[PDB]
Amino acid sequence: ISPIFQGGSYQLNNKSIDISSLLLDKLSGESQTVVMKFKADKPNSLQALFGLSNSKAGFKNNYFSIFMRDSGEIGVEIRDAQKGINYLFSRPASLWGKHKGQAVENTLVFVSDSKDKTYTMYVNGIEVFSETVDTFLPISNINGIDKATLGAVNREGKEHYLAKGSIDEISLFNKAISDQEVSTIPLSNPFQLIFQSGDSTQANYFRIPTLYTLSSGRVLSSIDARYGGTHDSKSKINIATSYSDDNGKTWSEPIFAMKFNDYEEQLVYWPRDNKLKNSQISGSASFIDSSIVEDKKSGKTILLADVMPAGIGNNNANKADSGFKEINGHYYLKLKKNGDNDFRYTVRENGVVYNETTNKPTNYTINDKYEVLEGGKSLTVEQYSVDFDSGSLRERHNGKQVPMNVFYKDSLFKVTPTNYIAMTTSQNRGESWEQFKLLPPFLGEKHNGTYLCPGQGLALKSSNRLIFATYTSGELTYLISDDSGQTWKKSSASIPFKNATAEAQMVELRDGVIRTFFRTTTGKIAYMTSRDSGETWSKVSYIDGIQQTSYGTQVSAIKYSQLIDGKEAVILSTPNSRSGRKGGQLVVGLVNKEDDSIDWKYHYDIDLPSYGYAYSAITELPNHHIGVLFEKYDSWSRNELHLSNVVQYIDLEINDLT
Ligand SMILES: NCCCS(=O)(=O)O
Numbered sequence: 001i002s003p004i005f006q007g008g009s010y011q012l013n014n015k016s017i018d019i020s021s022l023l024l025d026k027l028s029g030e031s032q033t034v035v036m037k038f039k040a041d042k043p044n045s046l047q048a049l050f051g052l053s054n055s056k057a058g059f060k061n062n063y064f065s066i067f068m069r070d071s072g073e074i075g076v077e078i079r080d081a082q083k084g085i086n087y088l089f090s091r092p093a094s095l096w097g098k099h100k101g102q103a104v105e106n107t108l109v110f111v112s113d114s115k116d117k118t119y120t121m122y123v124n125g126i127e128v129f130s131e132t133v134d135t136f137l138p139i140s141n142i143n144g145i146d147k148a149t150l151g152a153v154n155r156e157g158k159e160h161y162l163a164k165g166s167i168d169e170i171s172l173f174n175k176a177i178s179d180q181e182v183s184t185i186p187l188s189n190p191f192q193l194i195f196q197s198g199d200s201t202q203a204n205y206f207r208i209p210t211l212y213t214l215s216s217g218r219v220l221s222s223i224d225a226r227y228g229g230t231h232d233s234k235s236k237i238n239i240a241t242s243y244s245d246d247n248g249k250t251w252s253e254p255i256f257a258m259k260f261n262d263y264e265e266q267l268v269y270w271p272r273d274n275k276l277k278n279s280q281i282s283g284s285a286s287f288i289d290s291s292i293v294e295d296k297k298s299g300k301t302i303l304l305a306d307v308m309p310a311g312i313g314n315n316n317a318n319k320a321d322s323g324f325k326e327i328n329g330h331y332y333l334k335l336k337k338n339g340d341n342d343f344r345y346t347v348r349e350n351g352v353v354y355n356e357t358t359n360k361p362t363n364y365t366i367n368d369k370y371e372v373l374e375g376g377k378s379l380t381v382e383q384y385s386v387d388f389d390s391g392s393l394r395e396r397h398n399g400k401q402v403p404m405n406v407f408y409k410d411s412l413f414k415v416t417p418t419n420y421i422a423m424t425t426s427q428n429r430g431e432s433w434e435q436f437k438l439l440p441p442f443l444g445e446k447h448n449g450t451y452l453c454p455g456q457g458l459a460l461k462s463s464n465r466l467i468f469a470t471y472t473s474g475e476l477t478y479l480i481s482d483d484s485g486q487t488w489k490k491s492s493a494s495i496p497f498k499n500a501t502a503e504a505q506m507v508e509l510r511d512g513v514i515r516t517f518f519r520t521t522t523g524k525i526a527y528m529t530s531r532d533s534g535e536t537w538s539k540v541s542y543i544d545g546i547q548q549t550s551y552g553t554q555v556s557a558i559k560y561s562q563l564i565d566g567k568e569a570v571i572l573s574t575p576n577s578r579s580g581r582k583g584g585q586l587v588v589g590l591v592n593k594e595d596d597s598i599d600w601k602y603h604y605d606i607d608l609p610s611y612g613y614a615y616s617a618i619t620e621l622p623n624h625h626i627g628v629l630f631e632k633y634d635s636w637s638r639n640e641l642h643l644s645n646v647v648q649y650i651d652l653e654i655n656d657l658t
Helices: 020-026 179-183
Strands: 005-013 032-039 046-053 063-069 074-080 085-091 106-113 118-123 126-132 147-150 153-155 158-160 164-173 205-207 219-226 237-244 255-258 286-294 301-308 324-327 330-337 345-347 352-355 360-366 372-374 380-387 394-403 420-426 466-468 470-472 475-481 489-494 504-510 513-518 526-530 556-559 569-575 584-592 597-605 616-620 626-631 647-652
Touching: 005 020, 020 147, 032 046, 046 153, 046 164, 063 153, 074 118, 085 118, 085 126, 147 153, 219 286, 219 626, 237 301, 255 286, 255 301, 255 420, 286 466, 504 556, 556 616, 569 616, 569 626, 584 626
Parallel strands: 237 286
Antiparallel strands: 005 164, 032 106, 032 164, 046 063, 046 147, 063 074, 074 085, 106 118, 118 126, 153 158, 205 219, 219 237, 237 255, 286 301, 301 420, 324 330, 330 345, 345 352, 352 360, 360 372, 380 394, 466 475, 470 475, 475 489, 504 513, 513 526, 556 569, 569 584, 584 597, 616 626, 626 647
16 A cells, blocks of 8 residues: 655765655554665664654653664664653664675665554565564654654754665555565565575574585585574584576575484574573584585585584584494494493494494394384384473473484484584485485594585596595595595695684695685684695695684685686685674685696675675586675674574676676
């Protein structure tokens, strides 16, 4: 239905625009919708886009405002001192600033619903908050409202929260429009979603994107589908995949590459308040940090990820235990049975559960899905679900039976509580995935598994060699296969770091010459070089010209297929910031053929230096465009946890970058 007010092309240049006479006497009833299309590519630190206020002496705290911050945060205030109400609702990382050098038109829809007593904010087609209150306050029923303002809030006659930006369209309605109606408002988004809340994964959150271009032209993506908010393991996390057959324009409904079922796939709104935001699913098994590669010989797609048994993450993983027993140079998965104090069992060939104390097989076998069988019969456990109904996190049996898995909390036989690496493969380029297999230990019986570097593995162009980077304390540990991922060996490369999250990604500069770029603890991205297809590695150097935080962020990297300025080119994707995970860039490097040094010549700013940018994935699309799927928020910040739909995809051309 019709707007009660519609206006457009307002410039906000640190000077508010009064629209009181046009708008105020049109406001009626207690439910309102505001639709606003606006740009702000050089915002002030904190600025209001729209205000309704009592501008009179003594009523400073009687106003409604829609505001934003230069962090990309959006929100509203709804205040009335006489009613003793001061509502503030917001969500960080909700905005775009610029795309390809041009200011992005954001589409904001705020719904104020008196019947449901609920305030709801959408930006660019994404619901960023929905808040129900006991005492509802209609936005134009604030005591003494006498001003409607764009680009500030009028308090006691003065301009507060002055904005820099533009409002190209603003409309208001004397109605709380439905979610359906909202879905019909046209958008001008510079991005698309591949994985999103409410899709087939039923995870409300995602982290750790990957992208890889397959030989058929299909582009494949993997990701952590994270259920218990955005926390790393321990949690419930599955690995999901989606592909595009039209150069990234459209993407398939996701399927799982790796999943556990000890806990239900629940789409949950994780609390963001300071008291509860660190609530963590503590009894679920999970997968985390995936990586993809394609094998020329078999044609298979290979996907690796870390695996965590129930309640396990990096923080509490048994270090100094691989979880395997070594026997005659062969490694067998250890198991502990209900009631025992030690691990007295192993998993041998054909999944036979073997008793180590009495050196004989049992009537138990482990199938191909790491599920427990007794006499060929499937054992089961009861599934858990989570809720916050009690006012805090509970994990409780839900009445459903699922196959009993050795990675589960309720299992008869349980693996060592430490981290593993698993592998799965697809024979149809991402349409389905095999049951996962555990990789063996590479650094000994009594060393925990290395940590997979999320992103792409490396398929050497002139041989059948496949390489996956991993890391542990003191080194990068490259996993190398020459037989389609059937057998792996390691190649250790010392780095001058203890306890670094040394997430590494590789590019082949030329045949047999690999440069690996990796995260460090120094505030600088490091690199090392191999010239024998990964057998040996150079000492470590650093890139100047890009800054990271002390704790660092994953960097993604590819070798571009086409020459640029007549030179071989590498493209890096990373935040460029010493302060947080923000200031996303693609950095184009040109290779110097005389020494393989790289001149970082072009820096492309993905969005504003202050807008969030964290883990990232890049790939050269079949049409030579660049696809970027990235965390568009600060995934380190304790203030930006548990945000929906912030992993986003964009398409760029090389000319945009240069
Ligand atoms: N991938 C393991 C480290 C994730 S994070 O650096 O804490 O965001």
